[PDB]
Design a protein around this ligand. Structure first.
Ligand code: ADP
Ligand code: ADP
Ligand code: ADP
Ligand code: ADP
Lengths: 688, 242, 312
């Protein structure tokens, strides 16, 4: 009937469903079959697909309505119309008081009168009320009008605006969908590689995608897997188009000098002082040979390029095949079903002919490609490597860990963190239990990092954060004495049993998920009212079928506390603090070392080799030299058990550095002059 | 074909590109090359250039087609037409209910029917949905009409109106282009010193620009560095003429 | 000629074409001798110049000098040290100015440039100079005095009103709620930052201060940044230790070390107060000498001794 407020403000997700524009969502059979039976309840009969942006909670309804027009839907409301009310178009609606609800009330009778057997997907459903956007119109219409709809927005906004009254939850039961794994994406990414390779015109052999979605495993969870794998893979298909088709520069820059000198012979045939004749012969015959050489490739390669446009069309040809039979039987009108399909699908097989030649043609221009220094013609063959650069270019340092594990941690952790001989070892020895798969228990890799009040407890947390996962933003650093006792300790909210992040603010509750592959740390052992201390226990070592609740977390955890003798002292002074059960249920409790000479001396090398980086990374190049005589003033002042080793940096500035750049601005040490610093009384410089 | 709804409301950038009126964009090879590959995606295939006012994010669309009309572009949609849709040009003459969308409705089929391989960089693209300027016509168009466009508005206008729903992000991924520094300006003012010495009739030895772009370093970073510096330098080359 | 593929006029036009370039050097030989020799002829008596086509480091300087600020003072400084100005303008805080001077030269010089900006815990008596040192240096570490956004932390005392001030959330920058910080991170690039009441921190802004001072989109679809110099304020090392431990009742011990040097302000004495008495009459002569009339002002110590003690 009328489709106006439908059509101009919402799009039918059954249009591309009967048609086939929308990419065929393959798996997800868990949520698809359910929402059918949810939308068929008496109570809680409007499913809400709450989840992250990319999990497929629009793809869910995209594959939901797909198989509704084709085959599978109960003859109770089968092969009907589902329209996606995209409210982003009503967000920016006309101007005055309301002027959105009056346009909304138009959608209402449209759906109430024009064939009531109609479903509605709605994107970012919370905004219709919570926002100015008011959706007060549900109360009779969800009862009297009996509309059928599916929401799609993160439950974080379900916890905000979808629980206002009884009509809110009693009419919408929430359908949880959170994240597919590296093996769940690849499985669902197997079926949608069909649609995403053709819009680009590329053929990947196998290993770009496994390199892709498993690189999308740990890094671009910032924009997590199911829409970052397809974002990433679009670029890997989009990488080669500008590569194979751009007629490689090895050819294109070669011909600009040729036409420079060759076409010059044309007009140079006019009578001038005949110092021109020599340039004719020199530009005729030196440019005549090079003519013969570029003539084969720029055609026979562009003949391979000719097959490329021919095959992309040769494939997009087959697109019309599947859309025909689906509608041939959709209405049950086989008057055109059989007669149209018989002719030839082997347009598929009428095209290998182009492939037989081109296959020998991709690498034979490479076969011909070698005469001098080594240029590379990238053709359509994007591979395990071809994806690695996109990670390398966009996300982080170039391919170092990508190609390391594809085709041991101790030496790296210790050439960066010099102390704690067995501690790094014990951490490494306990970390290989979890990430390898040897034994996977309920608890994450828990550590009670206890040591002297400073010099390395959180420091070992940084060195492994780069190597148990990658990012340094995956550490939320805190001190337990920021929220000393019960009240301010109850302010920090990590994971309440029923609600996660409802009302009160914590850097933990949803920040559990803000850093998935991450470390966690809190530094003040003595600040615990022994209830947060225990809800820690039931979250480390210890969900909705229809219970209507959610909670989870998994990462690595290292608890911090500001020759086993003093251990038992701590163990029993931690008996004066903790429960005996607690001290065994985390892990082998691990201990940090004190400050000595040999460890302090190499960190002096680590702060002058660092001060050389911030010297070498800028413009000027000034060479730095320091002997033991100046070193022994700060070396003893450096290891400071009463405060820590952070005073190394403070008095490095207050003693070392401020007497350094002064001589650059005074004129004693220039950029080519060497700076020596000796200590007799006040550690002054010299240049002997 | 017909150029009315195009020409009287928008300017085809790629005109001067063939000619050389548009000043040659020098560096920025990072942002120029990508939007090609962005506009070639399946998902997030319409670049939105969020950045600061003057640093050079229309040169980017100017140097894109430049090295496209001269030499370099894959044979997939090469040396085609990009037009600068100035929505300020749709403001005049539109008074009644709409009177803008009907002038939009003219731009739509003009680009969908007359040689579909056509891109449009659009200035302050946020205004077409954010502003009574409405670009609600996307929903069939970015899907059925499959247009090729590049937005330009400071991320303040992306954070306002370019995040309404998924079609905003799933079709527009934002291309950050922020600011070429004093040695990047000298680098970007290196390549654009050719064009700016003749319109004024001046010969600078070296030290006007390094003193200027490094004096606009700290003071006229107010409005921005490379376009208060290339403004400033137009004052210093225009200084001598009088 | 090659833009389509028809080279019917490509070469024929270019062959005899290019020599115009070399036709303009003949003219140049003369004109070069003509630009500054007309300058050579200009001198017989006093008072006059020739300005020719030669726009230069100076020729731009006036545009800076005329347009942007006071005339050419800092432009020609480096062309052919901070204490005397800072101290002849801000008379107290002997080592504080120095310690500020000693810690500021780490960043803007390039000797060592860490993730954190030149952070300062500007702490001193609750008044008489806390924000005062901030103005004199802002004019010399960068240029504008509008590059100072002043606020008070007890204007937004505790958590809720503290959550109103939005400085830099992890994903969105300045999206919905109003704060004088989020995009004001970018409003003042060459700038100072300061807030005076540390104790109004619920220890979440304090650490997102820390995690933003001490620490963006490849494909993550997110943005955040800020960088300037920062000076943090709090309303014979004895009482220092008191602070360092009374700051334990407030801050985290880690926090008190991640700011490079904690720096201290001095009290009010006679010699520091008496030169500021001279600095308010040397200004009152400026606002006397800057207008039309000329009235000379003289006051003895006896009148000064009423307000001198009432002054500090
Ligand atoms: N069953 C499925 N089969 C194939 N692809 C799927 C499936 N479910 C989800 N997807 C993927 O989800 C992506 C789109 O995510 P989207 O629908 O925007 O998520 P959401 O609706 O949660 O924001 C597509 O790139 C598609 O590859
Ligand atoms: N193993 C180590 N190697 C080098 N430097 C260290 C080491 N442990 C601590 N530091 C120094 O300690 C400072 C930070 O103190 P930290 O050890 O992080 O205290 P906490 O771990 O209690 O937060 C850093 O500046 C760093 O130079
Ligand atoms: N890659 C580049 N090539 C040439 N000029 C540039 C480049 N980047 C910045 N510029 C400078 O920025 C100036 C104007 O920037 P424009 O491109 O008009 O920016 P916006 O629209 O952000 O205001 C140009 O005149 C040029 O002087
Ligand atoms: N070293 C100084 N030199 C000059 N004036 C000073 C100095 N210290 C304090 N003052 C005086 O302090 C007043 C400003 O107080 P201020 O210290 O800025 O308060 P707050 O730091 O709480 O903002 C000015 O009127 C000025 O006369």
């Amino acid at each position: 009937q009328e489709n106006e407020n439908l059509s101009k403000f919402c799009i039918d997700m059954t249009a591309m469903a009967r048609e086939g524009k929308i990419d065929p969502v393959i798996g997800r059979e868990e949520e698809i079959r359910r929402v059918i039976r949810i939308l068929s309840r008496r109570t809680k009969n409007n499913p809400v697909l709450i989840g992250e942006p990319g999990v497929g909670k629009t793809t869910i309804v995209e594959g939901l309505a797909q198989r509704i027009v084709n085959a599978d839907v109960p003859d109770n409301l089968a092969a009907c119309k589902l329209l996606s009310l995209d409210v982003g178009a009503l967000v920016a609606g006309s101007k005055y008081r309301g002027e959105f609800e009056e346009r909304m009330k138009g959608v209402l009778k449209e759906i109430q009168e024009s064939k009531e057997t109609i479903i509605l997907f709605v994107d970012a459903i919370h905004l219709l009320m919570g926002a100015m956007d008011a959706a007060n119109l549900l109360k009779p219409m969800l009862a009297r009008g009996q509309l059928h709809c599916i929401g799609a927005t993160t439950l974080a906004e379900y916890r905000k605006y979808i629980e206002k009254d009884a009509a809110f939850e009693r009419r919408f039961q929430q359908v949880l969908v959170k994240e597919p794994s590296i093996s769940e994406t690849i499985s669902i990414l197997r079926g949608l590689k069909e649609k995403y390779e053709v819009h680009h015109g590329v053929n990947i052999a196998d290993a770009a995608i496994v390199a892709a979605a498993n690189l999308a495993a740990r890094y671009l969870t910032s924009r997590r897997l199911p829409d970052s794998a397809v974002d990433l893979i679009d670029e890997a298909a989009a990488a080669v188009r500008v590569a194979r088709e751009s007629q490689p520069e090895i050819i294109d820059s070669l011909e600009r000098r040729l036409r420079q000198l060759k076409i010059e012979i044309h007009a140079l045939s006019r009578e001038k002082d005949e110092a021109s004749k020599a340039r004719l012969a020199q530009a005729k015959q030196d440019a005549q040979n090079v003519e013969e050489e570029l003539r084969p490739l720029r055609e026979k390669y562009e003949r391979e390029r000719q097959r490329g446009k021919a095959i992309q069309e040769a494939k997009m040809k087959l697109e019309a095949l599947r859309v025909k039979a689906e509608d041939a039987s959709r209405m049950g009108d086989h008057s055109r079903a059989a007669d149209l399909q018989y002719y030839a699908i082997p347009e598929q097989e009428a095209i290998i002919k182009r492939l037989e030649a081109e296959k020998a043609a991709a690498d034979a221009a490479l076969n011909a490609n070698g005469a001098d220094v080594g240029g590379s013609m990238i053709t359509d063959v994007v591979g395990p490597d071809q994806i690695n650069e996109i990670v390398a270019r966009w996300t982080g340092i170039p391919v170092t860990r990508l190609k390391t594990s594809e085709k041991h941690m101790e030496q790296a952790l210790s050439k960066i963190v010099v102390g704690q001989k067995e501690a790094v070892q014990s951490v490494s020895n306990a970390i290989r239990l979890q990430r390898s798969g040897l034994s996977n228990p309920n608890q994450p890799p828990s550590f009670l990092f206890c040591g002297p009040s400073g010099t390395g407890k959180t420091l070992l947390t940084k060195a492994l954060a780069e190597f148990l996962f990658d990012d340094p933003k995956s550490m939320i650093r805190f001190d337990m004495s920021e929220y000393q006792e019960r009240h301010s300790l109850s302010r920090m909210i990590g994971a309440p049993p029923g609600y996660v992040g409802h009302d009160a603010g914590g850097q933990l509750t949803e920040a559990l998920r803000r850093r998935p592959f991450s470390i966690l740390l809190f530094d003040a052992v003595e600040k615990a009212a022994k209830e947060v201390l225990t809800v820690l226990l039931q979250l480390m070592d210890d969900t909705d079928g229809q219970g209507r609740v959610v909670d989870a977390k998994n990462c690595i955890v290292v608890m911090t506390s500001n020759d086993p003798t003093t251990r038992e002292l701590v163990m029993n002074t931690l008996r004066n603090y903790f429960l005996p059960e607690f001290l065994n249920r985390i892990s082998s409790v691990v201990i940090f070392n004190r400050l000595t000479r040999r460890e302090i001396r190499k960190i002096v090398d680590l702060r002058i080799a660092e001060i050389q980086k911030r010297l070498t990374d800028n413009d000027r190049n000034v060479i730095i030299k320091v002997s033991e005589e100046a070193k022994d003033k700060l070396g003893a002042q450096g290891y400071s058990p009463v405060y820590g080793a952070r005073p190394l940096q403070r008095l490095l500035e207050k003693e070392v550095l401020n007497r350094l750049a002064i001589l650059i601005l005074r004129g004693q040490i220039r950029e080519g002059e060497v700076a020596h610093v000796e200590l007799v009384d006040g550690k002054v410089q010299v240049l002997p």
